[PDB]
Structures are given as C-alpha cells and as structure tokens.
C-alpha cells in the first residue's frame, strides 16, 4: 500500500499537555512536543491554546519526516490520579487535524485501576 501511518499519544492533565508522535509500533519516536517549551508561564501550559501550538509543531515535524496518517491515543493520568482528560485534548486533536494529518481511530487509553493503590491526599482529601 505504501502509506506511512503513525500514532499520536496525547497525555492530558490539569497542569500540562504532551503530544508525542511515533511510528505504528510505538517503539520509534518521530516528534515530541509539549506546552512547556511553547508557552512561558506555568499557568498557560495546560491551556488549549498551548495544546494547539504544540500539536501543530509536532504535526509539522511529522509531515517533514514523511507522515500522512495517524491514530490518536488520548490519555489522562489515570491510576490513582484524575481519570478525566484535561482541556488540551480535543484542542490538540483538532490542531492535528488542521495541520494536515489524516486521523484514523480515536481512543482513550487512560489506565483504569481495578481497585488498585491508595490516592494521595489523606482520608479528608485536599481542603483549600
């Protein structure tokens, strides 16, 4: 068939967003970009704007490297942490769409525990 398809792993949280493009197997990295080096203040890294910028940069790198199609994999921290993706997940996906990348299957691979470890914060939780 001769089409180079990859996988875009999106790590979305309430503090930062990471976009990482890799080959079909996932063992070879193509482009890794996040909001930390795109924005300046720590409060704007998880912003959808920073998500769009980082996803766009990763898309340009992948296109120059010779990637046309990609399968999305959204991921929240999961485990004992939050189970909900951050604001910069759909923004990153649509930025990848805008940059000129074909999008195949879209899935959430957040690690869900089957009554695993104890979450942080104590029994009373955070009281701010």
């Amino acid at each position: 068939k001769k089409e180079k398809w990859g996988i875009a792993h999106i790590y979305s949280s309430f503090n930062n967003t990471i976009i990482h493009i890799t080959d079909i197997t996932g063992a070879e990295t193509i482009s890794r970009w996040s909001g930390g080096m795109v924005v300046k203040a720590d409060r704007d890294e998880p912003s959808p704007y920073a998500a769009m910028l980082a996803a766009r940069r990763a898309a340009e790198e992948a296109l120059e490297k010779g990637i046309v199609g990609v399968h999305i994999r959204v991921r929240a921290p999961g485990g004992s942490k939050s189970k909900t993706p951050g604001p910069g997940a759909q923004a990153a996906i649509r930025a990848l769409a805008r940059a000129g990348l074909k999008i195949g299957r879209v899935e959430d691979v957040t690690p869900i525990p089957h009554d695993g470890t104890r979450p942080k914060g104590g029994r009373r939780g955070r009281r701010v």
């Binding site: 068939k1 001769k2 089409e3 180079k4 398809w5 080959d23 079909i24 197997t25 063992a27 070879e28 490297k65 299957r105 899935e107 959430d108 691979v109």
Partner: protein, 185 residues
C-alpha cells in the same frame, strides 16, 4: 541527524490471518525490529465493517530483508464496546480460563456474558461452569490457529449463548480477551 540512518521495514501479518501488509516501521538494524508489537483491527485485517471493535496484537519474530513477519500474541475487545455492553440493572459474568490447545499452545481466555436482568449468584455460577465446559471442549478439539480464528469470530460466543440460554437468557456473550502465555515446544 540520525533519522536518515533509519530505513523502513514492511510488517506482515500471520499467515492464517491472510498475511497482508499492516504498516511500515523505521529502524537502523534488523535486530531492533525483532520483537515489535503492532495493534490492528479485524476490520482492517479482513474487510468486514461489523468487527470494528476487535483488536489483534501481532508480534514480529523474523526479518527477511525489509519484510518483518509477525505472529499472533493476543486479542482484546474495545473498552468503549465493553462499557456500552455493561449497564445497570444487568448481570455481568466473567470467566478466566487457562487452557492448553491440541498442538500445545498455552492460552489464557477471558469470556464475558451479559444477562437481561439481575440474576442469582447460583445462576451466574451455572453459566460460568457452562462456559468453562464449552471452552475446554473447544480447546481440546481445535488447534491453535483455528481456535484463535473461532474465538475472534462470534461462533464460540454463539455456542456459549445457546448453551447458557438453558439457565437464563443472555443479553450478549463475548470472548473479551485472549493472551498467548507460552509457545509450544
């Protein structure tokens, strides 16, 4: 710049799955692509749109000059599909089974049954025993490749539903997961 040093290899699916190309992988040496795992769907492997929720894992085992052939490793149903299948006011029966195929493959099979309404623990136990019996009989009757094909196809689940209708009607029956533990020797 290290990227130019990389050259692409073509992934080939297992022969019993049609042996069709599934993707391209970049690597420097043929050794670095020996045990790479690629996740595909039965829809892409064969063509049927219905089985879009079934996922197959193919693991490389040999390289023949830009042609990396793979072998079956496991199968898992989609998380969204499982979530849709499971619902409140219904009973979910799960069966974990370690089985040996006729040829000698060691497999772990994870089967699921969804009932129309809440049922008693005794009924769930009876359904679990029925699933165990059918799975064991199929394991001792079939070989590895045809057993895996049967599991991916909705035939073993069909037999599970047909036999478990005696205890209680079933909303659905599935072989939700399969893992290849040890290869035969």
């Amino acid at each position: 710049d290290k990227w130019k040093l990389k050259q692409w290899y073509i992934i080939y699916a297992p022969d019993f799955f049609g042996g069709v190309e599934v993707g391209l992988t970049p690597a420097d040496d043929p050794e670095k692509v020996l045990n790479r795992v690629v996740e595909v769907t039965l829809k892409d492997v064969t063509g049927d749109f219905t089985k879009s929720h079934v996922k197959l894992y193919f693991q490389v085992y040999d390289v023949k000059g830009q042609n990396a052939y793979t072998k079956f490793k496991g199968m898992k149903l989609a998380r969204s599909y499982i979530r849709s299948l499971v619902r409140r006011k219904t009973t979910r029966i799960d069966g974990i089974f370690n089985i040996t195929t006729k040829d000698g493959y060691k497999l772990r099979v994870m089967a699921m049954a969804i009932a129309m309404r809440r049922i008693q623990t005794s009924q769930e136990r009876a359904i679990r025993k029925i699933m165990q019996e059918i799975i064991y009989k199929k394991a001792e009757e079939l070989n590895f490749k045809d057993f895996v094909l049967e599991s991916v196809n909705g035939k073993i689940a069909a037999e599970i539903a047909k036999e478990a209708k005696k205890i209680y009607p079933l909303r659905k029956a599935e072989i939700r997961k399969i893992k290849v533990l040890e290869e035969p020797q």
